[PDB]
Design a binder for this molecule. Structure first.
Ligand code: CV3
Ligand code: FE
Length: 287
């Protein structure tokens, strides 16, 4: 039983409902080839200069990812295609709003570009958020998902190069006795395609068996504004922040946030007013 494939043009309303039911879905043409081209162009350097996840020069090292992994967050100042294009995506926001309406506003927990080197071993099956948000394990089982992950293929995802393994229906599992690699299906995709999984879906990156292929992805974690992001955008230049849209500014934490409570008092407010009003932050300016 393979992962459902969907359209970013025709079947838009069916995407969240699918993930909801299966835990995963592939969105073909999630990003256009032109956008994926510029994204790669722009992040290429940073991917090569990034050190090991657990580098010694880091005060917040990551001991979970492997040495063959390279990750780059805080992509707003690096890429114009991310901050203008991806962040304002109508396919993304439709899915996000459909998924997180019960809770309210959402934002970006992380937007990272990940490049796996050749001979990169498979990861162990895991659920996201368990190394940053321990509170996600104390949620009831029927609680609607608090975060969803968009893994966008920046290059081909194949069986030889390590295409993601997913266990379907695993987001509705409490008992992890059936966790095994045999129960998984693959996510084959071309550049621009996106696998969409929730925070409770058991998945993993596969093994790179060729020795020559480099696999790259753009991973965007979206979550409710009630949870703290993994990455901070506090040091992003104001000129860059002021060149964004309001929606892009609020996704990055440069805005106040609301919740779905009927008489919501807000998040990140300053004596009744917004972050944006208080600092008189403009939008859509040039850089
Ligand atoms: C700790 N971790 C991340 O670092 C991470 C990396 C990129 C984007 C989101 C993200 N948040 C997570 O939940 C996460 C899961 C996770 C990653 C790798 C392995 C490995 F071990 F397998 F490698 C296991 C578990
Ligand atoms: Fe993961």
């Amino acid at each position: 039983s393979q992962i459902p494939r969907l359209s970013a043009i025709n079947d838009l309303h069916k995407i969240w409902p699918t993930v909801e039911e299966h835990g995963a879905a592939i969105i073909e043409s999630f990003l256009s080839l032109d956008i994926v081209r510029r994204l790669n162009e722009e992040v290429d350097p940073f991917v090569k200069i990034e050190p090991i996840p657990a580098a010694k020069t880091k005060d917040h090292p990551n001991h979970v990812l492997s040495t063959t992994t390279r990750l780059v967050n805080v992509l707003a100042p690096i890429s114009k295609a991310y901050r203008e294009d991806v962040l304002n995506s109508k396919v993304l926001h439709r899915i996000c709003s459909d998924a997180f309406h019960v809770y309210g506003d959402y934002w970006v927990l992380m937007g990272a570009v990940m490049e796996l080197a050749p001979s990169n071993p498979a990861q162990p099956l895991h659920r996201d958020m368990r190394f940053s948000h321990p509170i996600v394990e104390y949620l009831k089982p029927d609680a609607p998902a608090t975060s969803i992950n968009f893994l966008v293929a920046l290059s081909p995802f194949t069986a030889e190069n390590g295409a993601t393994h997913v266990i379907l229906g695993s987001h509705k599992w409490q008992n992890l006795s059936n966790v095994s690699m045999d129960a998984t299906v693959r996510a084959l995709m071309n550049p621009g395609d996106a696998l969409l999984i929730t925070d409770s879906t058991i998945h993993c990156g596969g093994a790179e068996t060729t020795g020559t292929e480099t696999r790259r992805l753009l991973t965007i974690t979206m979550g409710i504004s009630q949870l703290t992001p993994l990455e901070s955008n506090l040091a992003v230049p104001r000129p860059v922040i002021e060149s964004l849209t309001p929606l892009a500014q609020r996704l990055l934490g440069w805005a106040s946030q609301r919740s779905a409570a009927p008489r919501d008092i807000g998040l990140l407010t300053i004596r009744g007013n917004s972050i944006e009003k208080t600092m008189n932050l403009k939008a859509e300016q040039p850089l």
